[PDB]
Subunit: 220 residues, 4 copies
């Protein structure tokens, strides 16, 4: 008996409603997607980092140079452990991937593949916010960001609505790597703003948001 | 005077705002059972069970039925069904999309329903800011084609799609003749989903206007 | 002897595929669906594709979803539904042209395909037929619609040819009469229809042979 | 409105460069490369599915090669001279058809598979290593039978200008279907796998001879008209 809900375990049910505030937001940016020597995903990641630091975030950027393919080495590997620890530190993340062969990169997906959903006592991605972005040498398409939104859902991360797709990125960055004024840059600014907003509005409730009826019900 | 920033040349200094207020509220949850208007529709039954749970969590719920809805632009937007859906969508603070997997993808009914809702009705954005939970029923395996397409669609309706989702495999095995769902892990996941949706709706519905206050739009101060 | 490294196969139902009944104007049906708007750029692109297909030697039909009810909002008796089903059976190849509405295929397009059963008893109206996917958009050149329909082709067991068309800012590419101005977009449409006819000629004669699957023969349960 | 000397209802068609679509040829046993990529796990069910599919392809008359991604660096983490990269590229050229079998890790194809495909340029100067070659997509999963990986790979095939055959394989709870030696237990999943390899060989034989003709596009001929 559970108020016209036959299958519910009455003790494991809880109404959603809490206090708490923090001072800070850790945001890790995964420029992943290109280890290229001039990589526009890297330059876009760094512009996003500038914007996040202006918006009040503490930012770390992981470079996958020397990261082996998933399961090509033992997880003791330094790059793997760096990525896992940085994710642990993260409260939100930024995935910026070029559109290689009409999809997210092998680098991006390899980085996420090295991250366990549950690492012992820690769940490194669950509850953390996520903003997905993509650069492209051609048209403004969304193959990469679409795949990454779905992946975010499989990381039990809160993927923010807004996203940015930079078409023909080589035309938007100078030789130094800074991005020229454009609607693309403004969309990136909107995206980073929204990411910080959503991180502030949720980072305190992550433990409560991940308290699920299913998990409590297995209290048998 | 007043202008200019240190390392970021491209920003319009006045249009920049640090993200940081608002009070509480009462939460409207609109459920679109769309996907099958079949006379025994398992998507309909799952929608109704989700509504039971949502009302148990304290929600005011509306459920729209697409019976008689014409294809997008097959009738004037004056159409009663179209206006009902638009008004309910404005009423909503969060939503539930439950669609079967027809031909390995979301249905034309669901997609037609969303196609009838404009992103911008003049000054109003009917979906922006509202939360969203996507679920799917299937006669076969537990796949995610429909829910994946619907997560992306959520991204295009500027809605906050919650991470968790429900996919009912062999849905015909899970509902009795009355329409109630038998005990299974699927029901537990649906409860998880409605719980998370209500949590996120409460955690955002008061700040929705602030979250959609975007630097680009403020920069559009061209006058 | 009863096999050679493959324990699970029922040896009698196994067949090696070789060269197998060898052939005219290839039926290619175009589903302009995606817009019932009066001025629909998907419609104009569909008609340009039909012009090109007929120049390449095809017999073409174009179905309009005007008045088609939502799937199961009416009995399959509906004239539009049976018209579409019969046209689909007639087809040897198809063209699905959908605008990108809400970043995805339209409800019109998907509703049209939903009215088509994968198997209507013993006959499957989609199996074996070729497919070319194209998309028009009011904005950027994206691929959401063509990607979703490329997958749908696999779920309709249709052979979707590699090349596809994505028309960016279609309003800029069509005059008021509906003809498309010269562009890389039009040339790509021509490439797509050429490839579609090429692949249709290479498959229409083997369609029965290609759909003779080990699973089906193994069910020889007497 | 200067319009060349021929045309008819098609103002935009360059009358020169237009061609009517068609010849016979027998590499008689079709080269089919299988990329077990997706898992370098030591017991990888993707690998075992690849090997059973290879058995079936060889019985149906195909010459088969299987590439293992052990030691392949991430794309652009090393010079393309790297031995692993060059082996993969050469096998790709040798290929007339392919099989992509990837597990569904985190609800999508893996970084291993996509890194392998990212190492293959669409055009290395004048040659296209994937164009025209057939493609069969399959996936293994630790849970239910989903299609995220196979769908992403079906789209990738189009972007690799490959002809992806309709049928596909999705093996649910692969651990339940494989012995300790690596052979697959009898199941509907195995029947689908053979169906897929059958269709792949059928389409490879029906297209490998016309691929050059199939890849002759109005666009390329029209741009080959320079003055």
């Amino acid at each position: 008996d559970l108020y016209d809900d036959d299958d519910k375990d009455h003790p494991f049910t809880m109404i959603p409603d809490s206090p708490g505030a923090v001072h800070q937001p850790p945001r890790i940016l995964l420029l992943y997607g290109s280890l290229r020597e001039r990589s526009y995903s890297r330059f876009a990641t760094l512009e996003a980092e500038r914007l996040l630091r202006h918006f009040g975030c503490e930012t770390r950027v992981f470079h996958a140079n020397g990261l082996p393919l998933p399961e090509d080495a033992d997880p003791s590997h330094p790059k793997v452990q760096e990525l896992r620890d940085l994710c642990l530190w993260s409260e939100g993340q930024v995935w910026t991937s070029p559109e290689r062969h009409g999809a997210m990169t092998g680098v991006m997906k390899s980085q996420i593949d090295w991250i366990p959903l549950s690492m012992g006592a820690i769940r490194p991605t669950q509850g953390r916010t996520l903003a997905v972005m993509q650069v492209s040498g051609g048209s403004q398409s969304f193959n990469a960001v679409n795949q990454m939104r779905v992946l975010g859902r499989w990381m039990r991360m809160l993927t923010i609505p807004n996203q940015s797709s930079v078409a023909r990125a080589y035309q938007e960055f100078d030789e130094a790597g800074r991005m020229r004024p454009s609607s693309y840059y403004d969309r990136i600014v909107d995206v980073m703003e929204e990411l910080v907003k959503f991180t502030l509005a949720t980072r305190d409730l992550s433990a409560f948001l991940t308290d699920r009826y299913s998990e409590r019900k297995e209290a048998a």
